[PDB]
Amino acid sequence: MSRAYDLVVLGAGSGGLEAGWNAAVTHKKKVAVVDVQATHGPPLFAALGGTCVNVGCVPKKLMVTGAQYMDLIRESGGFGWEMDRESLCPNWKTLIAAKNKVVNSINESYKSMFADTEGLSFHMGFGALQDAHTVVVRKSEDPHSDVLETLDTEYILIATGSWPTRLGVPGDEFCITSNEAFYLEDAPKRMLCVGGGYIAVEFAGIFNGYKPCGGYVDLCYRGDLILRGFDTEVRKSLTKQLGANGIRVRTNLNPTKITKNEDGSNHVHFNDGTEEDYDQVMLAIGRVPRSQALQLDKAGVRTGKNGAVQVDAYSKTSVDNIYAIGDVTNRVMLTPVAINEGAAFVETVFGGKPRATDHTKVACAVFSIPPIGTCGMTEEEAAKNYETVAVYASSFTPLMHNISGSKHKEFMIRIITNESNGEVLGVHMLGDSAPEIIQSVGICMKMGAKISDFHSTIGVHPTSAEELCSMRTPAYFYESGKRVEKLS
Amino acid sequence: PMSRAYDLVVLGAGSGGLEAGWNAAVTHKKKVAVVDVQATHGPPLFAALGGTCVNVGCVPKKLMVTGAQYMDLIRESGGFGWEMDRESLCPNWKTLIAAKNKVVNSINESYKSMFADTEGLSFHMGFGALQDAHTVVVRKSEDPHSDVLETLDTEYILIATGSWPTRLGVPGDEFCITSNEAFYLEDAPKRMLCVGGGYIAVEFAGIFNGYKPCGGYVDLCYRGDLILRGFDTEVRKSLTKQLGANGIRVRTNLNPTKITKNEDGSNHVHFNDGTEEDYDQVMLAIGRVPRSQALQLDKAGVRTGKNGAVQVDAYSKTSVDNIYAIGDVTNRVMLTPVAINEGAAFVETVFGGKPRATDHTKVACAVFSIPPIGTCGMTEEEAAKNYETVAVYASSFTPLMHNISGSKHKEFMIRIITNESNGEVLGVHMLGDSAPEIIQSVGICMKMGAKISDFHSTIGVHPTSAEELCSMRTPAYFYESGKRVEKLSS
Ligand SMILES: Cc1cc2nc3c(=O)[nH]c(=O)nc-3n(C[C@H](O)[C@H](O)[C@H](O)COP(=O)(O)OP(=O)(O)OC[C@H]3O[C@@H](n4cnc5c(N)ncnc54)[C@H](O)[C@@H]3O)c2cc1C
Ligand SMILES: Cc1cc2nc3c(=O)[nH]c(=O)nc-3n(C[C@H](O)[C@H](O)[C@H](O)COP(=O)(O)OP(=O)(O)OC[C@H]3O[C@@H](n4cnc5c(N)ncnc54)[C@H](O)[C@@H]3O)c2cc1C
Ligand SMILES: CN(C)c1nc(NCCc2ccc3ccccc3c2)nc2c1cc(C(=O)N(CCCCN)CC(N)=O)n2CCC(N)=O
Secondary structure, eight states: OOOSEEEEEEOOSTTHHHHHHHHHHHSOOOEEEEESOSSSBTTTBOBTTBTTTSSSHHHHHHHHHHHHHHHHHHHGGGGTOOOOOSSOOOOHHHHHHHHHHHHHHHHHHHHHHHHTSTTEEEEESBOOEEETTEEEEESSSSSSSOEEEEEEEEEEEEOOOEEEOOOOSTTGGGSBOHHHHTTOSSOOSEEEEEBOSHHHHHHHHHHHHSOOSSOEEEEEBSSSSSSTTSOHHHHHHHHHHHHHHTOBOOBSOOEEEEEEOTTSOEEEEESSSOEEEESEEEEOSOEEEOOSTTOHHHHTOOOOGGGOOOOOTTSBOSSTTEEEOTTSSOSOOOHHHHHHHHHHHHIIIIISSOOOOOOSSOOEEEOOSSOEEEEEOOHHHHHHHSSEEEEEEEEEOOTHHHHSSOTTOOEEEEEEEETTTTEEEEEEEESTTHHHHHHHHHHHHHHOOBHHHHHTSOOOSSOSGGGGSSOOSOSEEEETTEEESSOO | OOOOSEEEEEEOOSHHHHHHHHHHHHHSOOOEEEEESOSSSBTTTBOBTTBTTTSSSHHHHHHHHHHHHTTHHHHTGGGGTOOOOOTTOOOOHHHHHHHHHHHHHHHHHHHHHHHHTSTTEEEEESEEEEEETTEEEEESSSSTTSOEEEEEEEEEEEEOOOEEEOOOOSTTTTSOBOHHHHHTOSSOOSEEEEEBOSHHHHHHHHHHHHTOOTTOEEEEEOSSSSSSTTSOHHHHHHHHHHHHHHTEEEEOSOOEEEEEEOSSSOEEEEETTSOEEEESEEEEOSOEEESOTTSOSGGGTOOOOGGGOOOOOTTOBOSSSSEEEOTTTTTSOOOHHHHHHHHHHHHHHTTTSSOOOOOOSSOOEEEOSSSOEEEEEOOHHHHHTTOSEEEEEEEEEOOHHHHHHSOTTOOEEEEEEEETTTTEEEEEEEESTTHHHHHHHHHHHHHTOOBHHHHTTSOOOTTOSTTHHHHOOSOSEEEETSSEESSOOO
């Protein structure tokens, strides 16, 4: 008697719109894809495309690229580009519109996909399990709410991604998350980004860019230094060049309460004791698995660490026929990984040859101004595992930044080796054009690459990149996981 | 053997000549002498302390090209909300030229400082020419009959005089200019013919383009059908498109025949197709002869020929046993990170006593036009005639930033050339923004024998122009035995 659908994917995400499209076209199995909304926009935010196309990195980088202009219009003067530059402030209006046009360009492009592909079905609403083989689609995350559709399936994939995490404090209602920020009407004059994640730091740089003439962006981390887990030396070099943009970072400082004001402002109590009136208060304080209202309890698939769906090597949950990927698994909160995990799922089940995604030596980026590329492990972690760690480093001020007046801007490179055999463990880069370089580095590292491989390679002059192959001498080492200056 | 004044003389403070001079003077402690023709950058000799790559080469070029790119990244800002008076946006050439004369004349001072701060590495200011296998005489002028200042007595000699812009070889060449005179022009040129299809005329075509005074144009001009001889076909086509966009008339199959000054001062240019047009300037970027024609290598039994290319073996050792040559005057590969690598290999050879030969192959080049290009390895065409079964992976698109910019014609082209036999990457070719940065890290993967099966099993970075290198799994076409097909005849 078999069954009606072969698969039903919960979430039209980076991770779900791989898994479906691969099962429907490259294995011709019947697929349903459940997602809450047609196209981007409040109040559902996340749409067809996922949380990295609508309220993700696609719109993020567009606004960041716009925010890069402030610098490049300031700098221009030194190369003889004579300009008004006495009241040149931008227009947040025309950016968000042009940004929407493009997210909306993608929103309608993916619909064409369903209509024009046989065996690939859209089902609008909230997904929810009733049993191992039954996925009820409703109007609300509420379970007493109305059954729009009832899908009958052999397999269930879960790809519902993240949802940004809240402070749970007085006046927490008056603050905003990443989502809300993409759909603000004006450019906050007085601005506060809370947190120290890529989430925040990027958004600082954005808001920093679109200031009405006079007005500011305060950062706020509850710890000592911004960007937990990144290269400590790099994290510092950033906090300075952030400072030079105008961004006032503050540290070991947490809000205690917010309240709304006379003119709709937000009065903010701090942990230190100071009180200020900002126009907007962004909580960029990480994000968490969205596994609450799927009723996994009902079908009996384990969750745990902040509701993260528990999965084996191969993305298989505690019920054999249920699977999970992307951010709800909680393995890496990224777009390119959620994809890979989902492509590996189809190769495993419908594919034929079992496979599970390789989560390490993942080249990453943060689009700060100026931006960071990092792949592999920090000297801090390297010291813990490997016998002998060697640590190369170099830093310099690119040629243009002599003429450009931005004398502070500097490029910084930090390579980390296993001295046991002279193999590369991590590569950490700050400066403009970084994340472009880390990608093609990230390939060499995947193969397995020694510092001798790097310094045995002729340069591309003149570029920021060529100091990858001009780093021969180590700056210090680690033995027993303890810092040194030569091998004893 | 016999006790000499210096251990090593070097003719030219080049990228090569200064790498050799320094490594010998500190890590092997020899008494080195380095000859060059002037204090600092500028006319009439241009090339100075720091080589034909810091004074009238790569460095100051790539500043001016960063300076040109701000034309695009201004009328491009408009779409991101950057409303600004673009009314009569006339850029000041003088302030860019000013800015760079300050920057170069600081690397020049910073070279003086290392010389006078370094144990027995001496600088000698003149035209250094050979007297015998152990002698180098330094004259005030390039003419042999010119006054003598020094006569260096040495065990070894090194030739690092590099290259020199080649003449057009046609009446009216006296009225033209080269790379050299361009860096030191008083005003920016209104009507500009950039003559030649080398990477140097191309890069320089943007300079006059970006910095063209209002109501002015630039024409590129070349011998053949497709500019940048020897780069990837599909790149060279797709580039010329965007030079058109940028606002450049690329007129191929053209070659000026005669030039004659006018009344105002502009240049009246008889073309090869019986055409006549007027230009305020005419810059030739047609080639680089090795620069050996006044060193008297004949006189020391050093063998020249092949344009002036000093004849050298797999370890840089010339026809004479104590004399060596490196950089552009050798005429192997004419990049700067080669001249340097040819230098420090030469010190490991002679003074190190653990010989090493410089490798000229799988060397990543890059061209700084607008947009730029990054290329390492061999072109589809060359590779199909070395291999049973080549396989051309290809991809191209418009970025996110141009989606909203307006210049939605802009593209980022990535073509991977593999040997189908074993899927090993014989060559990568890239157009578009941030290319030369990405290729540098790619040239490392290829030097480790990169296979395609490595590229598309490495997780990507979202969202980046580069990430499309790992996205390519399906080959566009193949080349079964030197002839393009559409699938392998299996
Ligand atoms: C501001 C921001 C910037 C980012 N920048 C980057 C970056 O630069 N690079 C990078 O690699 N990663 C980035 N990320 C991370 C990346 O966006 C995510 O890791 C990725 O989108 C997760 O894909 P996914 O398959 O897990 O599902 P998601 O992308 O989260 O998609 C989930 C979607 O499925 C649907 N859905 C969700 N819940 C349910 C439910 N209960 N029932 C039914 N349908 C549901 C909704 O339509 C929702 O939009 C960023 C994230 C954010 C928030
Ligand atoms: C416009 C332009 C752009 C370039 N762009 C790039 C690029 O992007 N990337 C790249 O890798 N390469 C580039 N190059 C080439 C590079 O800059 C150098 O020319 C070369 O790579 C280094 O050669 P060299 O070591 O012989 O140096 P050179 O500088 O050529 O050494 C010779 C120097 O010695 C002196 N000298 C010359 N003749 C005599 C003599 N008879 N007696 C005494 N002293 C003498 C002069 O100062 C002369 O400059 C470019 C060149 C030009 C002209
Ligand atoms: C090969 N591939 C991975 C995909 N191809 C296509 N269409 C045909 C593309 C193509 C290009 C060159 C080819 C050369 C030789 C043979 C076949 C080719 C097919 N649509 C694809 C697609 C992946 C997808 C797809 O699902 N995504 C495409 C994301 C691209 C964003 N720039 C989102 C995802 N699931 O990861 N889509 C959706 C259509 C679209 N462009 O919106």
